[PDB]
Design a protein around this ligand. Structure first.
Ligand SMILES: Nc1nc2c(ncn2[C@@H]2O[C@H](COP(=O)(O)OP(=O)(O)O)[C@@H](O)[C@H]2O)c(=O)[nH]1
Ligand SMILES: Nc1nc2c(ncn2[C@@H]2O[C@H](COP(=O)(O)OP(=O)(O)O)[C@@H](O)[C@H]2O)c(=O)[nH]1
Ligand SMILES: Nc1nc2c(ncn2[C@@H]2O[C@H](COP(=O)(O)OP(=O)(O)O)[C@@H](O)[C@H]2O)c(=O)[nH]1
Lengths: 238, 410, 433, 410
């Protein structure tokens, strides 16, 4: 009767429908994946991670059986398993599965894709947690360049990688480079107002700039940032 | 009390063509799935009329279901309750368990899980296969692991078909039993071992026609149904699936049951059905008899069988039987009834018999394993597909323990 | 006995009345597919409140006092297929074109065409009545026919007779989603009539009638077969005092009901509620006593209305018990707690008009019906007044109302006449606070 | 309540082969016209068994009906309910409206008048064509004039097929729309604009087979039927043809409707059919979405669809939709039901949606008209066949008003 049980019933039917559809027409694998992602999300929320894993493995087996191999699809499926492992707290496995995704893309054309830049960002973050700074920096830079070439410099995804690098540099106490990164993120994030970016990301940038300026000994600019973040978080109550 | 069913392997899916054409007859449904009794056990109520069965038709070599879902039975099974994948678990356990098993096992479990989250009283698994091939015994060994790891408090009944003692029918077949009979012994709560040598003979005496594996499976498909027809056609002495483990499995290893059917609309006066049920030639395995005493027999008498007769019939039968020394004088035989016979019959009988003779099936499959494993005689097909000799000798050391566990149970 | 006509306008009113005369005929022991009773024996209860003696053989059909009016043919032809020789098929009037969410087709249009034929059948019923003391018009306040011709007919009936109650048992628009795109128009055009020329407008709301069959009658999808049975069992509950002359039946006529429930001439929009909402699966050991049905009468999700009843002021209340009662002093003392619990309006010291009917319901043995004249019923019509204004600042749809004969001056009057209605409870809320 | 049908042009008559093979299935008649529900709507009862449809198969290039009345459907249509004349309204509006239109329009009307004097409750005209060609759009523009001049108080529903935004399919095709969309805007009470780009895509996702204009029209032929199946399969919430003008057409110009069908015997559990019905990709036009808010949507759910679900489904859908600011919160969406699904389906859905996005269809057909008219780019085929540039720019100034009338309706 619970709200979550209702969401699960709905998501299960929708998955079962996509399964049957892919029985009648084995090519429709992409849509099965999408429906699975919603149900897998819900299973994670209730803590059934093995069920979520089974769903993605099923998606993967269907993708693997295609007569025309779709590496982009496989890349995406592996990245969903990687993210599942990450939320599960299986940090090594998350890195392993993002790496598998990247290897499939590297062997086919897909080096400079949307998925690949995302994966490299997410993988870089796991490497930060593994305390492998150099590997984290490398992947973040690659994600950054790819998003630069795909979207303008003026995009949410570019600013997100800037932000993530900022936190990386800040956490290894490279204050100078942290500053550059967060300012570049600030510059972009100001120029992008609509539903293409929520204002809570803008507040994080000020928050992060605050800690960077404070670490730099500029306590003035630090408080100015912490202030503007507070103004933003307040202004989203209306 | 709604039993899921799994039909892995060509041997199991060919029983599924026999079983779900007998489950539709006993519940009185047409072949399409609609209504022409507890129908909730085998069948998921999708709509008001149509009853989709709780079966996965899990299979490699997808031509078996092409017989099923091509001719007359495509409307019955749900196609999100299936798996069809080439290659075909190449009569090779390591293909079925490891190579082409890990490709499908995420799809198998998430189709089981989409069939047991529609339940509302899940109790059992009538998982139907053989221990002979590579799909029924390889992927059948893999499902038993993953299903017990997912449902450790639910009874998993394996309805195996043993390799024939007569000849092989597959070259690497005594390897594929011991690699499977390990995982049945480790995971399944009770297995029914059936034998195509006995299924040939008893069907040869049944029909005035030389049998085929459709006619052999109707002996199995009644036994698959009669085990779980005191669960869905209640009657008196309601025997669920939880009572085939507590009553018939004394020690934690001795859970390999030898099931007969009788009579083999056919009526039988029933002082002779109990003599037909516990005929030594009507048991569906080549179990030992001159060096074999039972442990725990069962008797599920369905249809127009009234319970007064077993005080005179079955007490006479149990004196004729040979039990272990540690079983009581008139005890040792559980009973049950159903209030509805199978369609075509008017009074049936079943007998799950846990017996030391089934170790002679095990001793055959070890004496075949003894020569064949030490001389590497088909071993490299496992080694070059994931499964080493360490993993395979360890499979022997449990079955050599299991063949001793009945000899310790005499 | 006090005869009472049930006029059935629109698809929404007919499909209630398709199920209403299913109930009432089964309630009087009359076959709802032939009109004839069981052979030789009299119908139970007092049949002549709603029915008429057709054929003096004591086994012939009893024609109900009911005219079914709708401009679309498919609704009454559904009733003619599902009533047999029950209704008088001179009263089962239908047309071809329909109205289709256009008030100004039912009011001034195809409904104007049927009005010489409809009123020539009310005159057939009323002259056939002993002395008729109420007209229960079943319609919706959402469509083009039920809200259009229902606004026409009631203003064509009190204008003609006037000494007779018109209880417009009507179905408000659900606020969750509008079943007509011009549905906040068509209400306000009917809130001219249902405020001015109707003595009371018993509302029903399709949102609350979904919740009271989903959460209470424990089914997944409540169809309109079961919306028109929650309404029906309430309409066959408020009319059990009219139709039954039993042991200690408090025989409440419509005028006898509306003198207790219409405080002053602009406060006669009544909600309703039913108890028990026990599903028909024979929950025999969970059948509710009188101390706890009244606890289930006055829940916020227990009235047949979109509004929350206990969040506003019950102005006039009429709890109509119906069925086998063992406990008269346990009755009315549960309401003594409910005099304290419920928000009442001093402006009135006490108001609980309590009907007993010993003849039990079909679905229930001890059934209770409420009629609370609430101040929250302006808050349903505050939504309709607001959804009108969003569709009048733009000057919504088009010429559709204006080409039929209505004017922009007239439409602004009827918005004000619905603003005069909504303020008339806002007058009566804070003065009743 | 008996709807006449007109099938002008090769596009319309090819729908007539799809529509009157679906109207015979939903009413359950054989292809000859005899009995194998209100059958009086589409079909004129000639004799006790045979039902001749109320269709004119008005056509130039008489090879389309030679497909119809040659193969399997010659016994169905009455041949005093037709016109076949060469030449073929040479993808040229002025041939279809003026040159070869005035030759047949006395025969068209006197065949309509011989089909509506057999009625006994005439309500509508399901006039089926395209706005692309010269016969469907030229003579379709002429019939709409002469039918409104003859029956000014009857609803004339035009079931057009817009030129594709993808490519042309005819050179002079943006001329032929605006010359027709004028006369639809002037005469027809509500038009359903359909698009062969969306009819390709939705049929591509429907079938596991690359479509053709017989398979595309079965999407149309259900929409042609589902609009007028609450008129003949009554059910609850009886929606006649008079309620598709009062409910869905707010302003006196905005009567060009974008209709979807769902599901695309097929059953659908129906919380997802409402998500399939009001899918943006299931609407059968290339309407605008990122700059498009609806005016008035409809939902005709036929078959086994019970009305309790739309309080939970359709109220959820209308929150997901984008209406104009002057439409209420939960209102703005009319509904309906039928008590009988189409044959082959078990629960269907339709959605006539009046939307500002259909002005992007109009804005395309003006932006194509803008370059093509000022440079005389096919204009002399109209000028040398009756229709001047004064008559053609005046056609633009109404559609440029009409493309503004949706932008005024936001
Ligand atoms: N009872 C029965 N036994 C069968 C049937 N088909 C094959 N078998 C036996 O089952 C054994 C295993 O074959 P199987 O498991 O089907 O091969 P796999 O499916 O490729 O794993 C063989 O030794 C056959 O003798 C059948 O339909 N019924
Ligand atoms: N309770 C109930 N309400 C209905 C039913 N059918 C329709 N309605 C409601 O009635 C309102 C108007 O429909 P209606 O008056 O029948 O349209 P008309 O026939 O064109 O006047 C709609 O908002 C529906 O929500 C029904 O069977 N029962
Ligand atoms: N939906 C549909 N569209 C068609 C069909 N046949 C042609 N069309 C399209 O209709 C448009 C108009 O062609 P049409 O009106 O048949 O030419 P005309 O009959 O000579 O006037 C063309 O652009 C075609 O793309 C059909 O069978 N179904």
């Amino acid at each position: 009767d619970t709200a979550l049980e209702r969401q699960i019933a709905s998501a299960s039917r929708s998955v079962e429908e996509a399964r049957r559809l892919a029985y009648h027409d084995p090519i429709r694998v992409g849509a099965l994946v999408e429906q699975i992602s919603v149900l897998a999300d819900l299973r994670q929320k209730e803590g059934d991670f093995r069920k979520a894993e089974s769903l993605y493995r099923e998606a993967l087996f269907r993708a693997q059986e295609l007569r025309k191999q779709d590496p982009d699809l496989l890349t995406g499926i592996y990245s969903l398993l990687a993210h599942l492992y990450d939320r599960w707290g299986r940090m090594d496995k998350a890195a392993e599965f993002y790496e598998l995704a990247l290897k499939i893309s590297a062997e086919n054309g897909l080096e400079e894709s949307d998925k690949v830049a995302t994966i490299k960002n997410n993988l870089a973050m796991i490497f930060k947690q593994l305390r492998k700074f150099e590997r984290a920096e490398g992947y973040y830079c690659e994600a950054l360049e790819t998003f630069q070439r795909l979207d303008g410099e003026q995009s949410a995804r570019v600013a997100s990688v800037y932000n993530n690098l900022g936190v990386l540099y800040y956490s290894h106490m490279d204050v100078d480079r942290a500053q550059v990164m967060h300012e570049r993120a600030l510059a972009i994030r100001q120029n992008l107002h609509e539903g293409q970016m929520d204002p809570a990301d803008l507040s994080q940038t000020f928050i992060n700039l605050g800690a960077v300026y404070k670490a730099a000994g500029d306590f003035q600019k630090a408080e100015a940032c912490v202030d503007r973040a507070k103004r933003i978080r307040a202004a989203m109550n209306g | 009390r709604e039993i899921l069913s799994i039909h892995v392997g060509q041997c199991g899916n060919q029983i599924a063509d026999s079983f779900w054409r007998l489950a539709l007859r006993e519940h009185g449904l047409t072949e399409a799935g609609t209504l022409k009794s507890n129908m909730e056990v085998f069948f998921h109520k999708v709509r008001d009329g149509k009853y989709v069965p709780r079966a996965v038709l899990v299979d490699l070599e997808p031509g078996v279901i092409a017989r099923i879902e091509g001719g007359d039975m495509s409307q019955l099974f749900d196609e999100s309750s299936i798996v069809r994948k080439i290659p075909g678990a190449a009569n090779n356990w390591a293909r079925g368990y490891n190579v082409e098993g890990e490709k499908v096992i995420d799809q198998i479990m998430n189709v089981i899980d989409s069939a047991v989250e529609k339940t509302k009283g899940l109790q059992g698994f009538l998982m139907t296969h053989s221990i002979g091939g590579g799909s029924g015994s390889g992927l059948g060994s893999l499902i038993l692991e993953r299903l017990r790891q997912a449902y450790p408090k639910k009874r998993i009944f394996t309805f195996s078909v043993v390799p024939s003692p007569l000849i092989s029918d597959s070259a690497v077949e005594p390897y594929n039993a011991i690699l499977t009979l390990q995982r049945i012994l480790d995971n399944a709560d009770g297995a029914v071992l059936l034998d195509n040598e006995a299924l040939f003979r008893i069907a040869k005496a049944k029909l005035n026609r030389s049998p085929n594996y459709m006619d052999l499976n109707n002996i199995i498909a009644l036994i698959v149904s009669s085990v779980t027809a005191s669960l869905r056609f209640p009657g008196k002495l309601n025997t669920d699936l939880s009572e085939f483990v507590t009553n018939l499995v004394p020690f934690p290893g001795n859970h390999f049951l030898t099931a007969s059917f009788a009579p083999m609309q056919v009526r039988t006066n029933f002082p002779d059905l109990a003599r037909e049920t516990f005929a030594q030639d009507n048991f569906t395995a080549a179990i030992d008899w001159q060096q074999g005493v039972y442990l725990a027999a069962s008797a599920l008498f369905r249809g127009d069988v009234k319970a007064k007769d077993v005080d005179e019939n079955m007490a006479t039968i149990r004196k004729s039987l040979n039990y272990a020394s540690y079983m009581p004088a008139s005890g040792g035989l559980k009973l049950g009834y159903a209030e509805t016979a199978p369609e075509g019959f008017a009074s049936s009988g079943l007998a799950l018999v846990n017996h030391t003779g089934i170790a002679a099936v095990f001793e055959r499959l070890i004496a075949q394993f003894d020569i064949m494993f030490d001389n590497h005689a088909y071993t490299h097909w496992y080694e070059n597909a994931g499964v080493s000799r360490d993993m395979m000798a360890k499979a022997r050391n449990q079955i050599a323990t299991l063949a001793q566990s009945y000899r310790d149970a005499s | 006995v006090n005869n009472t006509i049930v006029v059935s306008i629109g698809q929404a009113g007919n499909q209630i009345a398709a199920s209403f005369w299913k109930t009432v005929c089964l309630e009087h022991g009359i076959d709802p597919l032939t009109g004839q009773t069981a052979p030789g024996v009299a119908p139970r209860g007092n049949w002549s409140s709603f029915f008429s003696k057709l054929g003096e053989s004591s086994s012939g059909s009893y024609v109900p006092r009911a005219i079914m009016v709708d401009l679309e043919p498919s609704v009454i032809d559904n009733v003619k297929a599902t009533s047999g020789s029950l209704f008088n098929p001179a009263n089962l009037i239908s047309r071809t074109e329909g109205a289709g969410g256009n008030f100004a087709v039912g009011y001034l249009g195809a409904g104007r065409e049927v009005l010489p034929e409809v009123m020539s059948r009310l005159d057939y019923e009323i002259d056939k009545c002993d002395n008729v003391g109420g007209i229960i018009v079943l319609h919706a306040i959402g469509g083009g026919t039920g809200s259009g011709f229902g606004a026409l007919l009631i203003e064509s009936l009190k204008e003609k007779y006037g000494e007779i109650p018109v209880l417009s048992c009507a179905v408000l628009p659900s606020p969750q989603v509008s079943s007509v795109v011009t549905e906040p128009y068509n209400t306000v055009f009917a809130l001219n009539t249902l405020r001015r020329s109707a003595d009371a407008c018993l509302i029903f709301d399709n949102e609350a009638l979904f919740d009271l069959a989903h959460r209470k009658w424990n089914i997944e999808s409540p169809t309109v077969d079961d919306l028109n049975l929650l309404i029906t069992e309430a309409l066959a509950g408020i009319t059990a005092s009219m139709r039954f002359s039993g042991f200690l039946t408090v025989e409440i006529t419509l005028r006898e009901l509306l003198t207790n429930l219409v405080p002053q001439p602009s406060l006669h929009f009544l909600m309703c509620a039913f108890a028990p909402l026990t599903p028909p699966d024979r929950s025999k050991f969970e059948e509710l006593g009188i101390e706890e049905m009244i606890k289930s009468l006055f829940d916020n999700g227990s009235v047949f209305a979109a509004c929350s009843p206990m969040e506003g002021r019950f102005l006039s209340t009429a709890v109509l018990y119906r069925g086998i009662m063992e406990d008269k002093p346990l009755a009315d003392a549960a309401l003594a707690a409910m005099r304290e619990k419920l928000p009442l309006t001093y402006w009135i010291p006490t108001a609980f008009k309590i009907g007993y009917v010993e003849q039990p319901g079909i679905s229930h043995r001890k059934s209770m019906v409420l009629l609370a004249n609430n101040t929250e019923i302006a808050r349903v019509l505050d939504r309709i007044c607001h959804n009108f204004d969003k569709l009048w600042q733009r000057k919504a749809f088009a010429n559709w109302y204006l080409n039929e004969g209505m004017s922009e001056e007239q439409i602004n009057v009827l918005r004000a006449s619905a603003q005069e209605l909504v303020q008339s409870y806002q007058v009566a809320e804070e003065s009743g606070a």
